[PDB]
Design a protein around this nucleic acid. Structure first.
Lengths: 98, 80, 95, 106, 97, 82, 109, 97
DNA sequence: ATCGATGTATATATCTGACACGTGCCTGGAGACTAGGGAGTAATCCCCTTGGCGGTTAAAACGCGGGGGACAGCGCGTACGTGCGTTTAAGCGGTGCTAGAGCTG
DNA sequence: AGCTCTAGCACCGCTTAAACGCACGTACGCGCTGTCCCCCGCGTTTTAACCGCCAAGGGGATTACTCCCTAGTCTCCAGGCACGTGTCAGATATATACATCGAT
């Protein structure tokens, strides 16, 4: 039989691969479309610098990764491994965002 | 529209890998999407306003950097 | 000097305009004065920066308007900015 | 006769003192004419909202005089003024009477 | 005689101290603690009474906010008892640890 | 020289502080952990206040200096002057 | 007229003392700027830049690189506990994050 | 056409790096990052020095204001090093012209 | 259910010290005028962003088995809430006095 | 450097409420087990992100020109803050009626 990894084995390898990596983990064009539909609610006919979208992507990914460390910490605090939306809500509540 | 769904589940999974999480619940991703959207709202609600001050209608990276400086998250890498 | 500058009488006039039968404590007056000073410092700092952004050496009504739209939260700003323009209108009509 | 700038703008807060504080605070080398008027209007509007909510809280506590507890109840109950002064603590303010649902008895 | 069930008198204190607004720490022990900590930075300092007041109430507000966060992450862990790990989790998520 | 006043932050004082925080039940090591947290918080705030005091060539820590030290850490305090 | 000598060489610094004084004046922080204040500020800026640069050079040597990349700066800032405290609210572009796994996440044999 | 004389700390970071690591080069993105870092630290030191200058009703910013701002916002031990280094530079500015 | 304590919502008489109101003054705000420098406006341009087409491939979408982690249930014993006697020190009032804050030249 | 005066520190005595130590009961954190469900690994499809290249146009930067707005100066006065007064809002006492917890 072909070798099949245990559930959670290659997940740790993927964590180790992406923790040392620095490239953006969200695709450029879907995030660009998201930015341009979000900016449409504040002013029509806007334009964007490419570096502006890059800065938005960098900041959004940094914020999401930091939120993921906090939600992982409070998921471990609940004697679990899987992160739940209640863990994210707790992390945002302790951080004073809600 | 559907561009909030453009942040696909592998992208949230990769961001959780960079955050160090093995197991991700199925209700995380859309919730994460919402949180991401909310965060972007605030930054855009600043950034275009800076553009609104400049009598411009293109958003430069410099306005985004100083928009991010307002909430307390200074971003190095695009200027000072 | 010995002179203790504060916003006590102006906050008192605002309170009597809003609630004529309601008094205020001296401690609450101190909190109101510190709140006015802190909000003024915040808006003035943002206006000073927004002047520095566009190489402008002056603070106009546009600086304060954009500073209010950044700093004061949403519909409050949607009130205050509009209300501010009314004051500017009363400063331009009355000359 | 000299008429003050606050009465010109129909405001209670001092326009001239705000102009003096803007100039002496050295925020910029120049200060426009309408900027102290606008800032004083914003300040008195914010003071009006805080004082109105504090007076409502004092009437709910049937107190004629506003105490700092009424100010804390005014800022913390309003969700929209809450994040304006989220980082700010208030002298003698206390906290909202909030109890979690899990800790409540059956 | 009469004795309340354990947990209900504590709920009475939660309603009592959230309604009230004065200091919960005694003034003189906090003043002595402030004098102990401040002597590490300069010997023979002096403190205004209002300085001790401001230090005490700011510390009280910080500790009550920390207790809010600690109780929230305690009930997140399906517990009604706050534990030290709740406090380190709260201070870690807040960014001060 | 004062010594061992951190125990002046007593057992029921920490209990009362938790009651205002909405805490129903309290563990035993909570008292020691909160004493440590209060100690480090006062160390930071008092260090900043003394640093402000030394710049004014003063030897009494003014409440105004404590207010600005708390403002520098993001915890703005009202009611003692602005 | 005497030979034009920069204030940085007089102070013994690489950072520009005169530019710091000019930006202090143009930043309008106060109506008067002292003589030694730009010298002190240039020295502090040079020291902080030197600290993070030598930590990033050590990080680049550990990764066996002769060019300092933003990943090296991220590793230099975050591995030092005290520079991390200085920049706890700062995100570095293309910096990534520290490789850190919590203790319970590791599998057991 | 005409271009604004773009202002940055590019060469000085390079000289400091060559002082501490002569062999090691550095990318342009790290020039942007380090320039942003030094600009941010300059802004916070200058703002804090102006803030203390306003607090003592002093119209000037001397080396004492900068030193106290460094002791305030910079975290502990390197602060003393920075302070010492700053003091050394001041001495080298006073012994010379 | 049930009653008894037990904390809680609504009507009047008394005191106090903290706040509302009145007096004085003096200094900062207001009226007037000018320069000149900074802000507003018109014309250019070029580069920087937007839009579009081919392709093609890595990544996203989807199906599906499974196993391991989430979650519910139960036993325990111990740690923590609650009560009472004791004592310990906080709190308050009063005295004194001097280091040092604050103001001025 | 000098003068003033003020509040911060030190000590002392009385009182009384808070803290502390101990007894005691039981509520809950934790450990263990059973279940089941739903997320992960991986194979197969598919799709659109991205790279490359090109057109275009328009908008931010650049310059010159103008003009009018605000810092600056001078002079005068009335409004805002030290100080004094007085008076009443709230705390405290009683009395009367209501919703809640415990133990049976």
């Amino acid at each position: 039989k072909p070798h099949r990894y245990r559930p959670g084995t290659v997940a740790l390898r993927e964590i180790r691969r992406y923790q040392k990596s620095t490239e953006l983990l969200i695709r450029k064009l879907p995030f660009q479309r998201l930015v341009r539909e979000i900016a449409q609610d504040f002013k029509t006919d806007l334009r964007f610098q490419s570096s502006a979208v890059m800065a938005l992507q960098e900041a959004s990914e940094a914020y999401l990764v930091a939120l993921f460390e906090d939600t992982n910490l409070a998921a471990i605090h609940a004697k679990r491994v899987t992160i739940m939306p209640k863990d994210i809500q707790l992390a945002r509540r302790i951080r004073g965002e809600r | 529209r559907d561009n909030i769904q453009g942040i696909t589940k592998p992208a949230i999974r990769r961001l959780a890998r960079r955050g160090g999480v093995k197991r991700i619940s199925g209700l995380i991703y859309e919730e994460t999407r919402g949180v991401l959207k909310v965060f972007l709202e605030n930054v855009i609600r600043d950034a275009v306003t800076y553009t609104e001050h400049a009598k411009r209608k293109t958003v430069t990276a410099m306005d985004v950097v100083y928009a991010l400086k307002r909430q307390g998250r200074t971003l190095y890498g695009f200027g000072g | 000097k010995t002179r203790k500058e504060s916003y006590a009488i102006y906050v008192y006039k605002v309170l009597k305009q809003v609630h004529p039968d309601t008094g205020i404590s001296s401690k609450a007056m101190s909190i109101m004065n510190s709140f006015v000073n802190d909000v003024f410092e915040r808006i003035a700092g943002e206006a000073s920066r927004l002047a520095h952004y566009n190489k402008r050496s002056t603070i106009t009504s546009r600086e304060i308007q954009t500073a209010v739209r950044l700093l004061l939260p949403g519909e409050l700003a949607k009130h205050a900015v509009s209300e501010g323009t009314k004051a500017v209108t009363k400063y331009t009509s009355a000359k | 006769k000299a008429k003050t700038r606050s009465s010109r703008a129909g405001l209670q807060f001092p326009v001239g003192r705000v102009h003096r504080l803007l100039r002496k605070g050295n925020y910029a080398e120049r200060v426009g004419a309408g900027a102290p008027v606008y800032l004083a209007a914003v300040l008195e509007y914010l003071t009006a909202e805080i004082l109105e909510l504090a007076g409502n809280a004092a009437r709910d506590n049937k107190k004629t005089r506003i105490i700092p507890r009424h100010l804390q109840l005014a800022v913390r109950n309003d969700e929209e003024l809450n994040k304006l002064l989220g980082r700010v603590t208030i002298a003698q303010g206390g906290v909202l009477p909030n109890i979690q649902s899990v800790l409540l008895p059956k």
